[PDB]
Amino acid sequence: LXXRYXDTMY
Secondary structure, eight states, X not given: XXXXXXXXXX
């Protein structure tokens, strides 16, 4: 979310 964060939030 609001960018890229692996695969825990996105």
